[PDB]
Design brief:
nascent chain, Trigger factor, RNA-binding, ribosome, alpha+beta, 1 chains, Escherichia coli, two-stranded antiparallel sheet
RNA sequence: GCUCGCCGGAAGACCAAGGGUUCCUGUCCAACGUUAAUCGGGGCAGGGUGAGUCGACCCCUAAGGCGAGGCCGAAAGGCG
């Protein structure tokens, strides 16, 4: 899951979780096809 | 979906006339439907009509209308 820890200043602590494209490009492709089968653009049928 | 029953020179398919979105899809049931309606030709929102060769347009005229001038009529106008 690519866990990484660091320290910024004072008492804080940052983490920089840099996941790969397979959990990023799919994250775009999971959020596209759940819209077109549900939403109705004004020019078309409901779900085509 | 399965049996049942009727029309079958029509209660079947088409075109002109006429109407004017009534056709398709989603959604809604208050009103309209001679009853209840999830359904509709009802309410709302979105789509749908592609032509050198089919029709209109155009070329040509019939009945008949209009009629430059012209004839005739108090005026309007009547014929050609």
């Amino acid at each position: 899951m690519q866990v990484s820890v660091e320290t910024t200043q004072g008492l804080g602590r940052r983490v920089t979780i840099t996941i790969a494209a397979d959990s990023i490009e799919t994250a775009v492709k999971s959020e596209l096809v759940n819209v077109a089968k549900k939403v109705r653009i004004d020019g078309f049928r409901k779900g085509k």
